[PDB]
Design a protein around this ligand. Structure first.
Ligand SMILES: Cc1cc2nc3c(=O)[nH]c(=O)nc-3n(C[C@H](O)[C@H](O)[C@H](O)COP(=O)(O)O)c2cc1C
Lengths: 830, 163, 182
């Protein structure tokens, strides 16, 4: 026997069959929760107000769990187990609260604030009724790890990921105060003992470090300076990385030994390297609070002794106002130089270090990517560097599109770092010995035998286990002396990567992704919940989700766009690429050239040699004029042989007669295979007409710039089923050309192009032989610029074919084309 | 008063102004989103997710483009449509500042009656409400109508229509 | 590794959009039969003449590219039943269609290789003057050397065959078209 109890808010309701024996207490709870429930609003888009019935049950669960005692099993445990079971039998069809909170955000009018309230309220209510996550959650990731399909590494963030680290630590203590409560008081008692133990700490820490006080009461929380000061910033980033790691392991229901055992390896960035060894050693929940005490003691002693070494220095208001007037950020001993090569930044450092003595020099501290460097020195000598750098940077409101690429002024964003000590700087070198003495005095040593999985050094990328010297000496020496090489350390092979670092969405996870996109490494941002709109990196939800859509890896461009060989019945060998598969001829075309491909002879003589050539619209002025040429092609070529038509997009009159002319020749079954729009890209409406009306097999396009490529992709979106041949041509091409370098725009867009599989990306502009094409067929061309291989579907040869025997070019023009020597890419802009 | 589809330069401006927590005069359009946000990339990447929720397609790297060059690019494929994000942003603006009970329909007919301002003006009018959000809930109904008069006077000044 | 033997082999190389075992099968055509899954299931999996026949969306007439009649005929409608006999070797594979003719189920379309380089979509009418069903041999060349449109309809005497069929259906004389119209 059961008695129905409804909980409603305006239009949304939920019915819960409460046992009639204890029903009269569930209507005592229902009135008091519906008092806590605000006034109803249209859309339910008000904050601290449920939007879904699911978020109303999760708000009730959290209201009842807020009153339950984890010692004294009161009456409200026997009313949580019936509304948390209905939660599991209404909403949680297998998957966690996180993979369905990801459903809510993207589908219903649900926000990240009330989603992280639902996560907190469910997680408090599950562990409140004394139901810890003990079972092994069968996440498709882990299933694949067990089967061997997936490999995981656990990266760990350093400093400067965010302006405020402490807000991720407040969000962990907000959502997970029930689970983290053990680590926070333990760390607060280790540090508040060290302070009375280690000398000078009491001086280093003025407002003290009883973190328990500032996490219970957010109001007393000091500025992000006493917090930003590294003797406090380091240990609390040590804490938050373990806090993510433990929160993951708990939710899963694995021991820190099991989660550690699963991972192929682990690594950290700057001072996150300590967390990686702290999780590599650990075996059991009991044998965790020894890895915690080590990590916290190390980060404490680096922090304290580095702040006593090179101290923070007061700064003239005259420098601070100028630095924040150019939006270069608040001056600090760490400066990030986005979108520039390493050699460039070292050049500028050398130029600034010319005017400075040895004690005040600036030195490249980090390389956090291909083009994402950090420099370190005295704030004044960094300002002195910044003065030189703002004299190179182009104005942000400038259009350079009409300027040659070599004449263009380089565009880049330099900023200062949210940090209060020059990490990986010679300035802190006198602290190394003192740190090492304070470690040995407290007896903190990481033994190479205790570390279970490999852990990758920041400086050289080697395993820390195989170290001859002290592991705690090497870690310190890596943090305060050695410049981190993030593209060197992340040279391991994996399928997924787990970001337990602070920062999340702007964390180290996304940085490593952009550093490694297209090597088939589905990186996971494990430190935050949200949905990736484009879906190239994951979040918290696919850690747990117990489905088939848990294993959805990233692409490995060198693999699925590896050119093959294939053979027909005749023993003819074809190069197989995405493009040649469609057209059934080699993926080599001759693009519409006025006047080289005007001649109906040269269009038929190229087709009868078994190749795809465009008839040049440019050369014809009336529907009759072209129609004669087409017919002459049709009469000359063999049966079943095809060809295409090239229409310039700056001649509206041509398009006006042309587009009908094709449309009705398609209607009469004329062998017109494809239309190539040259010199611009049609609008979505014009392209949508051309694709759906003219009954082609695919639409050629020659986008001019990056913006044009953006539009070409937008047409490829609108019409996903219809093949598009993006015929990308650099400025270095013959005839009507742009000002662009042939390479760079691909190195920006190539990812985004390959996301839509219908686009046959056809490279060209420069080529006249197999040798120089080979790098672009394979995808190795892009290795030179420090990218993953990015292989192309096919080519086009304008200028190379102009001296062919069946081209109408006058015999004296051919001697003039031949005579021309030509020049390598680099020189073309002259 | 003549009805036109909402201007996608005002919409963008309100988003960036309300998103950073700044007024309409402080942030000019001749400035990139990276410049005004400064350091914080946590803001940037989900401003780029909010612009992708409004208009859908965005340019390549709309981070370092002035908001004239970005607004102008939205005019190509925009037509008056508030969509999802701005419609929910006005739904959590009313349900936080307008007195408990005040509906959008009230304000709309009120703008139609007092001012003669149709739906294509009222979208842009509600965007001026959000961007210059009042501090606390305007419990007094008259105070909510005295705010709706001052913001419809900022809308009529900015657009350049006499009211 | 410079060994041509290692290179895969197919019939004809082409006509594969970039977006993407049974010998004796019987496919019943439902009202809500998916056209694409149907045609794939007719084509099977192996790339042979029959695969071209049901998945190419354009055939060749002379030099003109017309809409594939093989797909048009075999378009699934309720009451259609297709059998595929000998569907492990192409050379022998036949595709018989039966439909409800005067209530009862009768064979209509026999698609098969008449030769190694010739298709024949033998079309059959049952509703005749004498009762014996009348037969129309629509020939087609399967040339796998053209990987885009490997199916070219045999235009040689196509009118001669079609007429010769309609003669047997209408006229009750011996077939002869060499007389003066005047
Ligand atoms: C003589 C000549 C005529 C051309 N005519 C056209 C044309 O009508 N339409 C067009 O889009 N591109 C035209 N182009 C550009 C080519 O299609 C192609 O992008 C270029 O030739 C490839 O670079 P390459 O010459 O370095 O091989 C022409 C190029 C040349 C050299």
């Amino acid at each position: 026997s059961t008695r129905p109890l409804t909980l409603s808010h305006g239009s949304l309701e939920h019915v819960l069959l409460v046992p009639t024996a204890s029903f009269f207490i569930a209507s005592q709870l229902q009135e008091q929760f519906n008092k806590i429930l605000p006034e109803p609003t249209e859309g339910f888009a008000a904050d601290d107000e449920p939007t879904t019935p699911a978020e109303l049950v999760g708000k009730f669960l959290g209201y009842v769990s807020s009153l339950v005692e984890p010692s004294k099993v009161g009456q409200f445990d026997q009313v949580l187990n019936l509304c948390l079971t209905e939660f599991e039998n209404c909403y949680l069809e297998g998957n966690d609260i996180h993979a369905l909170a990801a459903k809510l955000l993207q589908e219903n009018d649900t926000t990240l604030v009330k989603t992280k309230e639902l996560i907190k309220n469910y997680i408090t209510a599950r562990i409140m009724a004394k139901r810890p996550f003990d079972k092994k959650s069968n996440s498709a990731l882990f299933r694949a790890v067990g089967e061997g399909n997936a490999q995981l590494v656990a990266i760990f963030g350093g400093q400067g990921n965010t302006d405020d680290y402490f807000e991720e630590l407040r969000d962990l203590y907000q959502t997970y105060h029930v689970l983290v409560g053990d680590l926070i008081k333990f760390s607060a008692e280790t540090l508040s003992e060290l302070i009375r133990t280690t000398l000078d700490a009491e001086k280093v820490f003025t407002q003290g470090l009883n973190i328990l006080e500032w996490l219970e009461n957010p109001s007393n929380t000091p500025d992000k300076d006493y917090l930003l000061s590294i003797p406090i910033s380091c240990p609390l980033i040590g804490v938050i990385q373990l806090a993510h790691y433990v929160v993951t392991a708990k939710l899963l229901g694995f021991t820190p030994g099991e989660l550690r055992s699963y991972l192929k390896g682990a690594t950290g960035h700057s001072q996150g390297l300590v967390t990686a060894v702290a999780i590599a050693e650990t075996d059991s929940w009991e044998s965790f609070f020894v890895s915690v005490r080590k990590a916290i003691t190390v980060l404490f002693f680096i922090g304290v002794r580095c702040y006593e070494a090179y101290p923070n220095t007061s700064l003239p208001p005259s420098i601070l106002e100028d630095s924040l007037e150019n939006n270069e950020g608040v001056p600090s001993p760490m400066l990030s130089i986005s979108n520039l090569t390493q050699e460039q930044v070292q050049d500028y450092v050398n130029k600034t270090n010319s005017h400075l003595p040895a004690g005040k020099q600036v030195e490249i501290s980090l390389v956090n990517g291909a083009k994402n460097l950090v420099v370190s020195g005295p704030p004044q000598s960094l300002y002195g560097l910044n003065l030189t750098l703002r004299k190179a940077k182009a104005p942000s409101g400038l259009d350079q599109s009409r300027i040659p690429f070599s004449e263009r002024k380089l565009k880049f964003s330099n900023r200062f770092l949210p940090v209060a000590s020059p990490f990986h700087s010679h300035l802190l070198v006198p602290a190394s010995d003192l740190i090492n003495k304070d470690l040995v005095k407290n007896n903190v040593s990481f033994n190479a035998k205790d570390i279970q999985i490999p852990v990758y050094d920041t400086f050289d990328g080697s395993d820390l286990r195989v170290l001859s010297g002290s592991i705690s000496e090497r870690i310190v020496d890596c943090i305060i002396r050695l410049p981190v090489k993030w593209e060197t350390t992340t040279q391991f092979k994996a399928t997924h990567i787990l970001d337990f670092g602070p920062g999340g969405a702007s964390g180290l996870g996304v940085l490593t992704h952009r550093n490694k996109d297209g090597t088939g490494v589905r990186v996971i941002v494990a430190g935050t919940l949200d949905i990736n709109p484009d879906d190239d990196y994951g979040f918290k939800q696919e850690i747990f989700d117990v489905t088939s859509n848990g294993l959805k890896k990233n692409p490995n461009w060198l693999e699925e766009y590896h050119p093959k060989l294939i053979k027909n019945k005749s023993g003819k060998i074809f190069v197989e690429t995405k493009f040649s598969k469609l057209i059934g001829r080699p993926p080599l075309l001759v693009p519409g050239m006025t006047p080289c491909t005007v001649s109906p002879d040269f269009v038929a003589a190229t087709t009868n040699a078994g190749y795809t050539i465009e008839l040049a619209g440019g050369g014809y002025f009336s529907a009759a004029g072209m129609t004669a040429a087409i017919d002459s092609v049709v009469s000359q070529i063999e049966k079943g042989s095809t060809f295409g038509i090239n229409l310039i997009y700056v001649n509206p009159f041509m398009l006006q007669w042309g587009i009908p002319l094709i449309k009705e020749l398609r209607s009469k079954g004329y062998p017109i295979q494809f239309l190539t729009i040259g010199a611009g890209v049609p609008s979505l409406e014009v392209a949508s007409e051309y694709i759906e009306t003219l009954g082609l097999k695919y639409l050629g396009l020659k986008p001019g710039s990056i913006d044009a490529i953006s539009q070409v992709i937008n047409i490829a979106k609108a019409h996903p089923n219809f093949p598009i041949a993006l015929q990308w041509t650099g400025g270095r091409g013959g005839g009507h050309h742009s000002f662009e370098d042939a390479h760079t725009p691909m190195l920006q867009m190539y990812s985004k192009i390959r996301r839509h599989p219908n686009i046959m990306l056809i490279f060209g502009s420069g080529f006249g032989s197999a040798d120089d094409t080979y790098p672009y067929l394979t995808g190795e061309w892009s290795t030179k610029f420090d990218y993953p291989p990015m292989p192309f579907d096919g080519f086009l040869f304008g200028s190379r074919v102009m001296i062919a025997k069946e081209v109408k070019t006058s015999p004296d023009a051919k001697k003039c084309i031949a005579a021309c020597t030509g020049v390598p890419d680099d020189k073309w802009e002259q | 008063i003549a009805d036109e589809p909402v201007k996608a330069s005002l919409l963008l401006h309100v988003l960036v102004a309300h998103k950073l927590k700044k007024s309409l005069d402080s942030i000019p359009m001749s400035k990139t989103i990276k410049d005004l946000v400064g350091g914080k990339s946590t803001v940037q990447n989900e401003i780029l997710g909010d612009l992708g929720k409004e208009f859908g397609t965005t340019p390549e790297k709309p981070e370092e483009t002035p908001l004239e060059e970005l607004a102008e690019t939205f005019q190509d494929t925009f037509s008056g449509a508030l969509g999802k994000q701005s419609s929910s942003l006005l739904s959590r603006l009313i349900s936080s500042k307008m007195p408990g009970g005040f509906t959008i329909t009230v304000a709309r007919k009120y703008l139609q009656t007092r001012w003669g301002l149709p739906s294509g003006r009222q979208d842009g009018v509600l965007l001026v409400a959000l961007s210059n959000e009042p501090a606390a809930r305007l419990g007094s109904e008259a105070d909510a109508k005295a705010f709706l008069d001052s913001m419809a006077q900022k809308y009529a000044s900015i657009v350049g229509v006499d009211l | 590794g410079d060994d041509e033997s290692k290179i895969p082999a197919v019939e004809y190389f082409g006509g594969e959009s970039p977006v993407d075992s049974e010998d004796s099968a019987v496919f019943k055509a439902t009202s809500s039969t998916d056209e694409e899954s149907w045609f794939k299931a007719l084509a099977g999996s192996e790339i042979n003449w029959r695969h071209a026949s049901f998945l190419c969306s354009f055939i060749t007439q002379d030099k003109m590219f017309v809409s594939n009649p093989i797909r048009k005929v075999f378009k699934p409608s309720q009451g259609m039943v297709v059998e595929i006999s000998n569907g492990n070797t192409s050379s022998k594979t036949v595709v018989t269609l039966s439909e409800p003719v005067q209530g009862e189920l009768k064979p209509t379309v026999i698609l098969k290789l008449l030769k190694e380089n010739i298709i024949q979509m033998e079309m059959i009418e049952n509703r005749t003057m004498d009762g014996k069903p009348v037969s129309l041999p629509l020939l087609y060349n399967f040339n796998p050397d053209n990987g885009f449109a490997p199916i070219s309809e045999v235009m040689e005497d196509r009118n001669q065959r079609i007429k010769e069929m309609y003669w047997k259906l209408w006229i009750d004389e011996p077939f002869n078209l060499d007389f003066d119209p005047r």
